[PDB]
Ligand binder design. Structure first.
Ligand SMILES: O=P(O)(O)O[C@H]1[C@@H](OP(=O)(O)O)[C@H](OP(=O)(O)O)[C@@H](OP(=O)(O)OP(=O)(O)O)[C@H](OP(=O)(O)O)[C@H]1OP(=O)(O)O
Ligand SMILES: [Cl-]
Ligand SMILES: [Cl-]
Ligand SMILES: [F-]
Ligand SMILES: [Mg+2]
Ligand SMILES: [Mg+2]
Ligand SMILES: [Mg+2]
Length: 135
């Protein structure tokens, strides 16, 4: 409910690569709120004084309805066009919840993708999110 910003005015965000297992072969994407036929990596704005790892796990619970074991920070990713900067973490999913905030509120969808297929569906509208998987 309060947006936060880095010193250069980029919006602060956090997200997780929500993998099905420690193999990191399949990842959970969620539907775009604006365009539900498109896929995105779940994530969102850091609240004031919120640790990035805490914001990442919170936004994944809100948007994707999953919980799990937080892993490494992958990196910090800027979107120059939209002026935001996202901390991206690995999350190993251990709990899949049936009727989560965004399912109830906006009918948000979620789906498992093989990594190669996640990169494919993100490339057109979300190429920075496709890059999250590069390394
Ligand atoms: O105007 P669009 O439809 O492009 O909306 C974008 C975005 O605009 P941008 O590119 O100007 O930053 C929203 O920002 P805000 O308007 O809340 O600041 C962003 O929220 P966010 O950063 O994730 O923040 P949280 O709400 O999750 O904390 C939202 O994601 P959803 O959460 O998924 O609804 C995106 O939608 P899409 O990616 O299609 O699903
Ligand atoms: Cl996996
Ligand atoms: Cl992006
Ligand atoms: F949000
Ligand atoms: Mg959100
Ligand atoms: Mg969001
Ligand atoms: Mg939010």
């Amino acid at each position: 409910q309060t947006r936060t910003y880095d010193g250069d005015g980029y919006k602060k965000r956090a997200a997780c690569l929500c993998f099905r297992s420690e193999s990191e072969e399949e990842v959970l994407l969620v539907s775009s709120s604006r365009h539900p036929d498109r896929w995105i990596v779940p994530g969102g704005g850091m609240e004031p004084e919120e640790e990035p790892s805490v914001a990442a796990v919170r936004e994944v619970c809100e948007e994707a309805g999953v919980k799990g074991t937080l892993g490494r920070l992958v990196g910090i990713f800027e979107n120059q066009e939209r002026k935001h900067r996202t901390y991206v973490y690995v999350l190993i999913v251990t709990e899949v919840l049936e009727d989560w905030e965004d399912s109830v509120n906006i009918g948000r969808k979620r789906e498992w993708f093989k990594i190669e297929d996640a990169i494919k569906v993100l490339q057109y509208h979300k190429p920075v999110q496709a890059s999250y998987f590069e390394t």
